[PDB]
């Protein structure tokens, strides 16, 4: 992609792809959002808003040519700059296996946190209603192993009456899961009992929510809409360092909320 003016950064082949791979590794396990919603293939660097498919009436019956606006859903562009030490990446070429690019590791994670935030609670400013804002899809849950199983099956039953069925997934706070794993200490693995009561579903632990969440990955209920996917580009050179960045273009919508169940 030509605009990330990467060709102009003072970096070798090895260097560029060493930076890329590091960020790819982190994004893969830290974009908790994408682990269970679906992504809508990159629409292009210039895609500006995703159509919502409604009109905004703006006329009296006093006017003959009645009319309105088409509701769209503008995409966020984000740009997280960071600096890397040149005379250090140079070291990659000298042989050095691990080069010090913690400057990048953090920036990546912060971008990751950003996106999840939008998937999970949304920017009111951008018009996207987050996952957790769907109050009508909240049910109460205990704190025993047994209380969780109960929740699951009651959930599977709310789905059953909406027709909603995919493979089912448990999104769950990392620490909360450590806690359920306390009382279920070697009688029989909680992992498998949850996966069973989910009918062959999977379980995603995450530090992006504080409670729990249940969805069906049957697909097409949680669109993350990509314009230009997460890329790395070059901004400038600060004497003895390089300023790269991390751009993305996106938005999000919960289409069929009935594929969603929130917890306590």
């Amino acid at each position: 992609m030509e605009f990330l003016k990467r060709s102009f950064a003072p970096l070798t082949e090895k260097q560029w792809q060493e930076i890329d791979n590091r960020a790819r590794e982190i994004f893969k396990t830290q974009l908790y959002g994408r682990k269970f919603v679906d992504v809508e293939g990159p629409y292009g660097w210039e895609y500006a808003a995703h159509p919502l498919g409604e009109v905004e009436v703006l006329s009296d019956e006093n006017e003959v040519v009645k009319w309105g606006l088409r509701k769209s859903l503008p995409l966020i562009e984000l740009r997280a700059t960071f600096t890397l030490d040149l005379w250090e990446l140079d070291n990659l070429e000298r042989g050095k296996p691990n080069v010090d690019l913690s400057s990048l590791e953090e920036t990546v994670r912060k971008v990751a946190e950003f996106e999840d935030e939008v998937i999970f609670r949304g920017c009111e400013k951008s018009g996207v209603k987050g996952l957790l804002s769907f109050e009508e899809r909240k049910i109460e849950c205990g704190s025993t192993p047994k209380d969780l199983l109960e929740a699951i099956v009651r959930a599977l039953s709310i789905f059953s009456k909406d027709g909603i069925e995919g493979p089912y997934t448990l999104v769950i706070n990392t620490d909360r899961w450590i806690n359920f794993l306390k009382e279920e200490a070697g009688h029989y693995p909680l992992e498998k009992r949850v996966e069973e009561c989910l009918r062959g579903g999977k379980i995603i632990t995450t530090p992006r929510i504080e409670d729990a969440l249940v969805v069906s990955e049957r697909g097409g209920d949680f669109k993350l809409i990509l314009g230009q996917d997460l890329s790395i580009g070059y901004e400038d050179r600060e004497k003895d360092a390089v300023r790269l960045f991390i751009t993305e273009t996106f938005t999000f919508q919960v289409v069929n909320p009935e594929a969603l169940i929130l917890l306590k």
Partner: peptide
């Protein structure tokens, strides 16, 4: 070129 290419 560029990009990064993640999407699950």
């Amino acid at each position: 070129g560029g990009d990064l290419g993640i999407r699950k």
